[PDB]
Each structure stands twice: as structure tokens, then as C-alpha cells.
Design a protein around this ligand. Structure first.
Ligand code: B81
Ligand code: B81
Lengths: 231, 9, 214, 9
């Protein structure tokens, strides 16, 4: 019922506000960097819930589907936003306006350097394709809707998710068509962008494993909303 | 999921 | 060309591989994976232009994709039998048989769920050949880009030959590639499980599988 | 990576 441009513009107005975390005055330790990253993720998780509720048709899903989709996608959605903030800054991860981290700063936390390279490499892939802003809005919405496997054969949830995922796909094809590039380039661009969803999923899985390990080693504490999403 | 249910309603 | 490339991918298809306790089931799966890994290298070397890439790129592409490619083949073999995983001609596993290995039941459900979506989408033989080759060339986190462009062009050509509308062609292309994110997800969870099984000394890991695991 | 290099050459 909503036009592709109307969906893209609705996603634009639904963008969450910037989260203001700051680099601590004391130099970074393994516990302090993990504390800053987890605190940022917890604050961003609040805005993601409000953002997801503004995606057209999301609130029409059952409460079970809403929690299940957000439970499986929250790490991918946060990392996708980080890649967008860092798309024009090679070798740096723009976690926040006042939390800019260099690649070598990942040596402060054991095992996180590999994830930093994964996030930076996928960011470089989006930069090489010159990922436009409106393309980013569609991709990030696709991540939430394509997070939990819902085969058509709750059956109503898989059907609604298919209609929702189809609508955002129509929006993304429309943004790519507005560039005026050839039809062969349009299909190629759609393919290259959507293949990168697997790289975002891969970064999320390794980041999920790392965060669960940091909690197991009692390095970072996990509290409130972030804890619920980890359970 | 107390907070998530609350933030969703 | 798209038509020539699809037929080349068909002839490069690997031969069938001929391989219950928690140790015996893990032994059969790891032995199967090791044999399939040998055939996957031979399969990749038949991809036009793959051997023209540097050895560093050839090794890097196979290192990151081998688990996804094996699982992609498993879902294709099991696409027409819900609740069953056709690991090999002599290795057919039911869903409930995943209860035999600790932690693998969740991965079996993930593989079967993604398989059901490929079944609902009616994944074609020509689409499967392009998608599996795309996984090898794309998984890695100049000649490579030209090769990936050719296989991508082949997939759009296969979908265009289906006669469906241009909007449905873009939707099917999107739906197929969106499922690759779930295949990658299954690959990541399978990676974690295999490393844990090796750490817990449940299954031994040998030769090529060991190298690809490190 | 000996075996992978060998099988590729
Ligand atoms: C989850 C980790 C802490 C949280 C980090 C993640 C890397 C990327 C992001 C996205 C950003 O928006 C919030 C922090 C978040 C979510 C890290 C990888 C390892 C560490 O455990
Ligand atoms: C990796 C595991 C053993 C090997 C299994 C994998 C599930 C699917 C496949 C694909 C098949 O071609 C070979 C076995 C292989 C690769 C399993 C998931 C958990 C277990 O560790």
C-alpha cells in the first residue's frame, strides 16, 4: 500500500538518534574498552526497539515474532550502523561521535582485533561499492526482517515477513534504479549489496561468540537490556 | 523479557 | 558467456562421496567432510579463471567458504525430503538423530529450516550452480571481481530465462541471496560446534579438515 | 597450509 519511495522516506525519518558515549579519561584496558562497548550497545538497543516499531508492518506481527526477530538481529543491526558511520574513515570504527577507535586499539581486548578487521573489511566493501545513504536504510531494515528463519510451511508470521521483506526489497531496487545505471548494473549492484548481508551476519556471529566469552571470563559485566538480548 | 516487552508496548 | 558458464559449472559438479554413538556420528560427518574437501578443490579448479588467480587468493577463497559450500550442497541434496539430511548416499540422517550428538540438534534444525526455504522457492538446478560458485568467490571477508561478475551475470540470466516479470526477477534474486546469509549463519554455528567437538576430544580431526579448521 | 597449496598446484 506504501510506495517504494514512501517506504524509503519512512525509514529515513525513523533513523534513531545519535548515542553520546565518550572515550574515558583513563587509558583503555581490556575491561574498560569492553565496558564502553557494552554500555554503548545497551543504549543503542533502546533506540533500536523504537526504530523497529516504526518499520511499516512490524508492529502487526505477533509479540512472539517481534521479540524473536529482535533477539536474532540486534547484533547485526548495531554492526551495520557502525559500518555506515565508519564508511568514509578507513582503518577507524566510528562507534560514536566521541568514541572513535583505530584498528590497532583492538589489541587492548583479547580476540576483538579479528572482529575489528572483519568490521573494517566489510566497511571497505561497502565503501568500494559507494553505498548510498538510502541504500543503507533498506539494507538495515532487511537485516531485521531476514534474521530468523521463518519457512512458509507460526505460518502467518512467515507470510507477513515475506510481504515485509518484499516491500523493502522493492524499495532497494527502486533506490538503485534512481541512479540511472544500466539494467545489468542494477541487478549486479543489488547482488553485490545483498551478498554483503552474509558478511554482516558473519561479523555478528563472531562478535556474539566474543561477547559471550567476555561474560564467561567475567571481564565485562552485562546488565539490563543488553543482558536480555544475550540470554 | 521484561524490558523488551515493555519497550515494545 | 552465461549459457556456457552454467554448463561448465554443471560438468564441474563433484562425484558422490561414499563414507550410532556421538563419536561414531561425528566420525562419519568429519570423514565425509574431509573427502568432500578434496573434491571441492578439484571443483573450484574447474571454475573458468579460478586457476588464473594467485595461489594466495585461491587459498584464501577456499579457506573462508569451505564450510558454507559443503552445507550448500547438503541442503541441495536434502531439498526434496523435509526432516531429513542427505549427507551422503550411505549417510541419511533424521532430524531426531541430531539428539545423538550434543549441541548438533540446533544446527540440524537450522540446516533443515533453510533447506525448506529453498524448497518453497523451488530452487532450480541452474540457480544452485551459480549460487554455490558465488559463495566460493564472495565469502572472503581484479580477475576475481571479473569472475564474480560473470557468475552473477549468469544467475540474472537464469532468472531472466524463467519468463517472470522484471519485478519478480529482482525479488527472486533478492530472496535467493538473502538465504545465503542463513547458510553463512549455519556455517558459523557449524564451525563453532566442530571446534568444540575437537576440543572436547569427541571426534578426531585429520589432514585437510584439520588445516581448513585452523 | 601445505595440503591446500599442494592440491592447488
Ligand atoms: C560485542 C562486542 C562489544 C559490542 C560491539 C561489537 C562490535 C560492533 C558494535 C556496533 C556498535 O554500534 C555498538 C557496539 C558493538 C555491538 C563487539 C565485538 C566483540 C565485543 O564483545
Ligand atoms: C561440522 C559438523 C560436522 C560436519 C557437517 C556439519 C553439517 C553439514 C555438513 C555438510 C556435508 O557435506 C559434510 C558434513 C558437514 C560439513 C556439522 C555441524 C556440527 C558438526 O561439528
Amino acid at each position: 500500500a506504501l510506495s517504494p519511495e514512501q517506504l524509503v522516506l519512512t525509514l529515513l525519518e525513523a533513523e534513531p538518534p545519535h548515542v553520546l558515549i565518550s572515550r574515558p579519561s583513563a587509558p583503555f584496558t581490556e575491561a574498560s574498552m569492553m565496558m564502553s562497548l557494552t554500555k554503548l550497545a545497551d543504549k543503542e538497543l533502546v533506540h533500536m526497539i523504537s526504530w523497529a516499531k516504526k518499520i511499516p508492518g512490524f508492529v502487526e506481527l505477533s509479540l512472539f515474532d517481534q521479540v524473536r526477530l529482535l533477539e536474532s538481529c540486534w547484533m547485526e543491526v548495531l554492526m551495520m550502523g557502525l559500518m555506515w558511520r565508519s564508511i568514509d574513515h578507513p582503518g577507524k570504527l566510528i562507534f560514536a561521535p566521541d568514541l572513535v577507535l583505530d584498528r590497532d586499539e583492538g589489541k587492548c581486548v583479547e580476540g576483538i582485533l579479528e572482529i575489528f578487521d572483519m568490521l573494517l573489511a566489510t566497511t571497505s566493501r561497502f565503501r568500494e561499492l559507494k553505498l548510498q545513504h538510502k541504500e543503507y536504510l533498506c539494507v538495515k531494515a532487511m537485516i531485521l526482517l531476514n534474521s530468523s528463519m521463518y519457512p512458509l510451511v507460526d505460518a502467518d508470521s512467515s507470510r507477513k515477513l515475506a510481504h515485509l521483506l518484499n516491500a523493502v526489497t522493492d524499495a532497494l531496487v527502486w533506490v538503485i534504479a534512481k541512479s540511472g545505471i544500466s539494467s545489468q548494473q542494477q541487478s549486479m549492484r543489488l547482488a553485490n549489496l545483498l551478498m554483503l548481508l552474509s558478511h554482516v551476519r558473519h561479523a555478528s556471529n563472531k562478535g556474539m561468540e566474543h561477547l559471550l566469552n567476555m561474560k564467561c571470563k567475567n571481564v565485562v559485566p552485562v546488565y539490563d537490556l543488553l543482558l536480555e538480548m544475550l540470554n | 523479557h521484561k524490558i523488551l516487552h515493555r519497550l515494545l508496548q
